[PDB]
A paper describes a structure:
Due to this complexity, the helical parameters were determined by cryoelectron tomography (axial rise 5.2 nm, twist −50.1°). These parameters refined to a distance 5.03 nm and twist −50.4° with the cryoEM data. Helical averaging of the cryoEM density, from each cross-section of the filament, based on these parameters led to a 4.7 Å map for the entire filament. The pCBH ParM filament has a diameter of 26 nm and of consists of 15 loosely associated, left-handed helical, single strands arranged in three layers in cross-section. At the center there is a single straight helical strand. This is surrounded by an intermediate layer of six interacting twisted helical strands that have the opposite polarity (antiparallel) to the central strand. The outer layer comprises eight non-interacting helical strands, which have a different twist and polarity (antiparallel) to the intermediate layer strands but have the same polarity (parallel) as the central strand. The 15 strands are in register in each cross-section despite having different radii and path lengths. Prominent in the acidic patch are two acidic loops (A1 loop and A2 loop), which adopt different positions across the basic surfaces of neighboring protomers in a lateral cross-section, allowing for multiple types of inter-strand contacts.
Functional ParMRC plasmid segregation systems comprise an actin-like polymerizing motor (ParM), a centromere-like specific DNA sequence (parC), and an adaptor protein (ParR), which attaches a plasmid, via the parC, to each end of the growing ParM filament or filament bundle. Thus, the force generated from ParM polymerization is harnessed for plasmid segregation. Here we investigated the ParMRC cassette from pCBH, a 257 kb plasmid that carries the botulinum neurotoxin type B. This ParMRC cassette is also found on other C. botulinum plasmids, such as pCLK (267 kb) and pRSJ2_3 (245 kb), which encode neurotoxin types A and F, respectively.
Author numbering:
A (entry chain q), B (entry chain r), C (entry chain N): 1 to 349
The structure:
């Protein structure tokens, strides 16, 4: 029996994942306290399970705890922090989003021989430091998820020879383009992978050799600390205080709505803030281009094709084309590049 | 033939109802017992049928009891207590007020196979608490009504899959404005209905989505149970006992005459209580605004059009404009918002 | 002058004490030898006096014995028994624990002729059997205690008519909730309080009368000797030695850490005993289900609230929910449940 495989992304913009059977889930990194949903059931019947994940979690002593999670969490004004959310990998906030995307992707009642090979991700510089905090976490991981309003459960438990760790964007450029990168790579060319995340952006590059195989360069690749979408949400936060001049603060929902579209329905009116949206997209891309050439000296002329990824890279792409025009390009799925890049690369074993 | 529909509200200021054929009747929720009326029939023959509803109602054991009900029972001193009466839905005072609203709206020649889809309702916090008690009541509602001085007898009995249980304020804004409010709602706003009634104030809100479709907020919407127009009838009679200086109390007719005008006829004189009436209509409006704003934080700036309804919401519209000026609005029928909202949203069955 | 209030508990697991001004202490009930602490001062800060309890005790005949007690004594390998500690309530061990309890709670700058009223704890059967043994030893008390490395002594003396005696589980529901649950208690129910102590578990119920006052049932309430947290340390003792397969015994310290973690670090390795530790609490959870219904026939259905107490029940609340799910509930401070009741109900004088 071929043991199952689930690859998930432990991001902070939105939690991404995909199973062995190519079903993929996506939801923001937002939790909230769960409460009993019976009245709104009669109003709006829940068909999208992902939109309204109402969920209970058991543990080693059945210490039951319910959660509004996902879009259901984002509907709450009592939701997660999301502006100073936990960077510790062993937080319960990380435990919620990890266990939730399991039962979204585990098919019902798998055989016990067919256990699940989970392949997860870390930040590039933080792959070494927070490895044992997550290696201990995944080995200790033994719970029972309960789906409220959808009513199917998993006794989630994982061990070694099933848990698998890779940095952010490890097998995204090695595999999944593995038959198409062979035309790209010739001899001593430099491929580039840029995952524009929420908190940090990882620029990860491989060096191909005389034997046409990519070797890793930890000196041309690092974690751009504090550079991502979190600057754009912070900058557009101050633009609302500058335009409305009320001192009012947008919530978690309105500020994410602001940098998604540019127009917030404030006091019956669309406060138009579209001007500093694309200006922040240029300024973030300018921060990326300038910090691209920090690690990159004259080796930028050794490029064959740069790939970009991340949810931020999908909306930056025209201004993020200004790294290397007509050579840098977008990956097939900007969000899900790490997802299948952990999955088929995790299906190697 | 086709099964009929009669949409009535179990109102405690006045019973609000309208049938499938768009005939509507309305009467205060006051019952008495009944005695045969032939003396005043010679003086005042019944021109207004609703003004003088003497009613005889058989039951499943055919143990009939006579009842003065409505404006007639308001003219009776032997009427129900009605100001400290419970809102228990299977009580004897509710079987009379429901059936009296039936036979005024029941058209002639309804066969027994064309069972009336009575669209009943429960308040917003009471649609979970008091749902099975009306399932207790409507299953038990097996009676036979007879009108006095008009004399057409309707065999009143209702079963499951004919009866209908929507929340109060649910279909009043999900339907009945659904073709018009969608022109006003575009993106992630909150539409809301506040039914300021007699005992309860149903503040019910929806959240619309990107697709201009409302999802229900069960945490920004609640019933202000015990907060309504019954506090104004409570407040102003206390000011009259110190103004009359006899210690006497206005009864179930004169107290309704008191806060509706401000000046009660006492011993050849209309004793004035105009000053504290506006104070009663600000203090009630003080805790419909601020009690909604306990559920309405900074998402109140994302509101588009707050609707208000109810007979109390009809008469607070100057003071209840102070929820948010030039954003709040009154529905065209403050009485028949819920009843047509029962009816229009009861057309789906 | 005024006579102050200090409430302590003679819990065999850990002594739990509080003054009138709500400054409360907690430390395990283990003593050891007191030796010269000079060198440990220079390396590490002796800041928390609860962490570093080096104690000299003068007698009234001044024999001047010296003790490590509690947390520092827990780190001593030559400590007290604590798994077969003697049940003599008049022991010097109990005195040293009580003198340490009084020392951290008697404040400085207390006026000259002030004294303290003190409240103790007794098992509910042993409050009458073992009454005068403790009630003479508290009268016997006149000692001077010295806290090393903090430089303040306490000459502590008590007489008759200042000590006060109430048994275990008394004040936690007779007071401390009497202002709150009196809204909840109506007529002829029983409230529940389950103190999950270290050695003995406490079952106590109060009948409420018609007039909303608590009254006591001696045959619906008992003291569970031999039932409590102490069975779990006995169970996990052999559970390690059988799993060590060497006869290697944990110390007194790792014994306490074992039922707090289940993963003891041993010979450079985590010995995981999570299997038996889940079973042992459920073994204790089973043995309180049966003793509950031993005192509760159909009178279990005559409940309106069940509380639980004891430091063990804090990690057993969801696991002792199996008797009455959501009819049972949790006290605020499961350690300090008896003491705050002894604080509040001890304020009769
Ligand atoms: N359609 C979109 N419009 C605007 N921003 C988007 C869109 N899609 C994704 N994003 C941004 O991308 C981020 C998602 O990044 P993601 O690839 O999940 O990285 P991470 O792994 O760090 O979470 C979100 O925080 C969001 O701001
Ligand atoms: N013209 C009016 N003047 C004063 N008060 C009115 C008037 N019309 C209605 N009301 C008040 O509104 C209440 C009716 O509320 P209603 O919408 O029937 O709510 P409910 O469903 O709780 O009975 C009455 O009790 C009455 O005090
Ligand atoms: N955090 C914790 N983890 C595990 N066990 C605990 C914890 N806190 C308290 N306990 C257990 O509870 C006991 C304390 O019980 P306590 O309320 O002091 O009762 P007593 O009055 O009999 O001493 C300890 O022996 C300990 O085993
Ligand atoms: Mg990422
Ligand atoms: Mg109403
Ligand atoms: Mg105790």
């Amino acid at each position: 029996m071929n043991k199952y495989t689930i690859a998930i992304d432990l991001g902070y913009g939105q939690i991404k994942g995909i199973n062995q059977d190519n079903k993929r889930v996506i939801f923001p990194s937002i939790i909230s306290s769960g409460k009993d949903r019976s009245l709104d059931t009669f109003f709006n019947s829940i068909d999208n399970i992902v939109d309204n994940i109402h969920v209970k979690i058991l543990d080693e002593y059945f210490n039951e705890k319910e959660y509004f999670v996902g879009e259901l969490a984002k509907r709450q004004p009592s939701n997660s922090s999301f502006i100073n959310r936990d960077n510790k990998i062993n937080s319960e906030e990380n435990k919620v989003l990890l266990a939730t995307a399991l039962g979204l992707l585990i098919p019902n009642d798998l055989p016990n021989d067919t256990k699940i090979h989970i392949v997860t991700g870390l930040p590039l510089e933080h792959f070494i430091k927070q490895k044992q905090a997550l290696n201990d976490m995944l080995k200790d991981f033994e719970h029972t998820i309960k789906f409220v309003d959808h009513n199917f459960s998993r006794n989630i438990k994982f061990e070694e020879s099933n848990i698998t760790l890779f940095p952010q964007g490890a097998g995204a450029i090695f595999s999944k383009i593995n038959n198409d990168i062979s035309s790209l790579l010739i001899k001593e060319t430099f491929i580039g992978l840029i995952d524009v995340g929420f908190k940090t952006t990882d620029i990860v590059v491989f060096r191909i050799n005389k034997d046409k195989e990519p070797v890793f360069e930890q000196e041309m690749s690092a974690t751009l600390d504090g550079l991502g979408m979190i600057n754009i949400y912070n900058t557009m936060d101050k633009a609302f205080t500058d335009n409305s001049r009320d001192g009012s603060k947008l919530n978690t929902e309105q500020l994410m709505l602001l940098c998604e579209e540019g127009k917030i329905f404030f006091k019956g009116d669309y406060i138009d803030l579209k001007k500093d949206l694309i200006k922040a997209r240029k300024t973030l891309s300018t921060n990326i281009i300038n910090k691209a050439d920090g690690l990159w000296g004259s080796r930028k002329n050794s490029f064959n094709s740069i790939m970009i990824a991340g949810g931020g890279g999908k909306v930056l792409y025209n201004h993020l084309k200004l790294i290397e025009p007509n050579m840098c390009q977008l990956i097939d799925n900007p969000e899900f590049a790490n997802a299948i890049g952990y999955l088929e690369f995790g299906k190697q074993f």
